[PDB]
Amino acid sequence: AEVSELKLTKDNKEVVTLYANGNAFDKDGNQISSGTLTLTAKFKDQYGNELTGKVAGTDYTFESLNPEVLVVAPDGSVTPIVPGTALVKVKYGEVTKTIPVTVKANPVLETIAVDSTGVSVAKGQKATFKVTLKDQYGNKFTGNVNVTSDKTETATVSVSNSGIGQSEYTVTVNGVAEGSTTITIKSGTKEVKVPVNVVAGGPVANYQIKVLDDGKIDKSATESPANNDVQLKVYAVDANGNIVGDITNDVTITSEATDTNGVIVNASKSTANGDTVYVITDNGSKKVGKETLTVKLGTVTLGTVDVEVIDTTLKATVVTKKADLIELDAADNGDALAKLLANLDIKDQNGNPMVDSAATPNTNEKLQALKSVLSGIVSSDTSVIGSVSNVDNLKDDASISGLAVKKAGTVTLTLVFNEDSKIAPIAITVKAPAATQDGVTVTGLDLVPGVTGVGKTKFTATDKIKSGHKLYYAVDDSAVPAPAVGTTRNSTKFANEITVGTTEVAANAGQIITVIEVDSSDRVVGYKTFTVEAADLSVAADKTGFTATVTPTGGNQVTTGKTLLAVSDLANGHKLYAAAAGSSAAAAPVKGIAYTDTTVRTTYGTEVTSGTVEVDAQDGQHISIIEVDENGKVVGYKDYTITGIQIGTKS
């Protein structure tokens, strides 16, 4: 064999970055918090076949060659300890592999970034700039904040959200008195200073447009942090680039008269404390993209700015088929939806997998995911599998369905994705094989003559059947088409059950018997066609089966009213029985039946095997006789016609 894969993962995400605190990330620097941290591993045999269904913690273990740094439990689970480089290893029979792993030091406040170099505001008005906390790596870092002015009488200051619980705060510098001073920032150990110069300017000219937030709205229903808005404010500035006033309330903003990009929104002023803000919100929006906004001061037009709509969380995007074919078995139970889905890899915007988790037993994610992007499916043959117009017909509450099976055959199912996903159709071939002998448990099945009547036959075999299964049959002058495997028993065609070595069927020679073997859930697995050979059928006895030559006899040595039955040359252990003497012959039983049958023993109740017997009789009366074999079975039958010549006389 050969180990084909050895990955570090947490909730089906290949980890790249890991910290000592146990917090991990993907490739896109996105944190992971679902599932357990573990080591993924896959194995291939010597030919290149992936081994599966194996036990993690029995068929293959795990160890950490550097436990001073990191523990890797045998099952596969992981719990890091301290920063460093650690080695990990796997076992299976006699294999072995190894890969490095690295625990990074926990993030710590390194840099305090700034969105300016020196602030300048008008007396009485208020200014603004951003701050970004960065760790030693240069990524975002959460922490608290304190801000102060060296000269509050000259310039006060305020910060949002209490200056706690984020990695991005907004500073708000309210300009008090004319002069120059400095603002001191404080977070943890480190400190940063901002030069401030309040100036009493105000010759208008030049208008600015400021985007406070990310400048985006997420039309997804669970974006975090809550990003369902864009926050704006209009400022008048002087020539020297210093804010002199706010006029957000005296301005008219307008989008296009009618949508042209599927990006639709609504603007609205939200006044409070004399401080006016212009808020943007979603108005439906079918698509993502930019939407330019036109500012106006009553009738003028000042400047334009573009906002951006997005939809996130998770949206199916990439899809690939593995094989250009699948062939079904009984385990599919007659619904080609299960095995189909397995022949498809799905990945989201991030090229990240999407799967039906077992945490959601009665609902499929990979399915429900595909439902959102699928438009239709076109079966090449509807008589085999029904095409899909409506997608809401697909569902998974354990019963994963349904591309139901109608008939045995082979088809082409092409899928129709939305133009939204821009995903080209993907064709898959599907074989629906008909049942055959291969799926038959009961061995050595052939037909034999019946014993109930004539023109009939019987079933029999060697071993018994896999407990739970059953048999049904049909018959016509032609053969019945074999059904697709997994199909339910067409209880209309096949309704006649078979209990082996008992049930029997009326039929003629040249005809055809079709059969099927069902499972516990009444699904087809087997199929075998019998042609009726004339010898397989049953018939009544004749003089043919009658071997012995019997001679009715009278004379002056036999009792009157009675006749002597002279037996001559029968076979070894064969026996003979006689019926009542009537004016008409008795009924002739079937060849093969036992003597012990009630309809028989009652009729032919008089054994005369000895040939030394005499029973009542008359001239034209008839008498019926039968021949039994060495095993207690009937063989022959001959109805004699008597004459007075062979009747007794004297007393």
Q: Report how far residue 394's alpha carbon sits from residue 400's, in angstroms, rounded to the nearest whole number.
A: 8
Q: Is residue 324 part of an annotated ligand binding site?
A: no
Backbone angles phi, psi at 438, to 5 degrees: -55, -30
Site membership for Ca ion, residue 357 (CB under 5 A): yes
Is residue 428 within 8 Å of residue 340, measured between CB atoms? yes
- What's the per-residue H, E or C state across 532-561? CCHHHCCCECCCCCCCCEEEEECCCCCCCC
CB of 284 to Ca ion, least distance (A): 11
Q: Which is nearer to Ca ion, 100 or 510 (CB)?
A: 510
Site for Zn ion in 397-456 (CB under 5 A): 438
Q: 330 in helix, strand or coil?
A: helix
Buried b (16+ CB within 10 A) or exposed e, 264-285: bbebeeeeeeeebbbebeeeeb
Site membership for Zn ion, residue 616 (CB under 5 A): no
Which residues on adjacent β-strands are paired with residue 648? Answer: none
Site membership for Ca ion, residue 360 (CB under 5 A): yes
Q: How many helices (H) and strands (E) does the chain have?
A: 3, 48
Using the rule CB under 5 A, which residue among 263, 370, 428, 485 binds Ca ion? Answer: 263
Q: Report how far residue 69's alpha carbon sits from residue 80's, in angstroms, rounded to the nearest whole number.
A: 7
Site membership for Ca ion, residue 228 (CB under 5 A): yes
Q: Which stretch binds Ca ion (CB under 5 A): 47-55, 240-248, 357-365, 471-479?
A: 357-365
The secondary structure of 9-37 as a DSSP string is EESS-B---BBTTS-EE-SSS-EE-SS-E
Q: Which does 438 bind (CB under 5 to 8 A by kind): Zn ion, Ca ion, none?
A: Zn ion
CB of 261 to Ca ion, least distance (A): 4
Site for Ca ion in 280-309 (CB under 5 A): 291
Inter-CA distances, 445 with 448, 468, 493, 527, Å: 10, 18, 22, 12
Interface characters, 200-219, with Ca ion (x: CB under 5 A): -------------xx---x-
In the numeric block, the tokens 């109930």 are attached to: 452
Rg (CA), the chain: 47
Site for Ca ion in 63-122 (CB under 5 A): none
Q: Which is nearer to Zn ion, 417 or 527 (CB)?
A: 527
Q: Which does 282 bind (CB under 5 to 8 A by kind): Ca ion, Zn ion, none?
A: none
Burial (CB < 10 A; 0-12, 13-18, 19+), residue 104, is middle
Q: Which does 228 bind (CB under 5 to 8 A by kind): Ca ion, Zn ion, none?
A: Ca ion
Site membership for Ca ion, residue 356 (CB under 5 A): yes
Site for Zn ion in 457-496 (CB under 5 A): 476
Q: Which is nearer to Zn ion, 194 or 480 (CB)?
A: 480
Which residues on adjacent β-strands are paired with residue 243? Answer: 121, 237
Site membership for Zn ion, residue 533 (CB under 5 A): no
Q: Which is nearer to Ca ion, 64 or 166 (CB)?
A: 166
Q: Is residue 438 part of an annotated ligand binding site?
A: yes
Site membership for Zn ion, residue 327 (CB under 5 A): no
CB of 438 to Zn ion, least distance (A): 3
Q: Report how far residue 474's alpha carbon sits from residue 67's, in angstroms, rounded to the nearest whole number.
A: 70
Binding residues are 213-214, 216, 218, 220, 223, 227-229, 256, 259, 261, 263, 291, 356-357, 360, 363, 365, 438, 446, 476, 533, 536
Binding residues vs Ca ion (CB under 5 A): 213-214, 218, 223, 227-228, 259, 261, 263, 291, 356-357, 360, 446
Binding residues for Ca(2+) are 213-214, 216, 218, 220, 223, 227-229, 256, 259, 261, 263, 291, 356-357, 360, 363, 365, 446, 533, 536
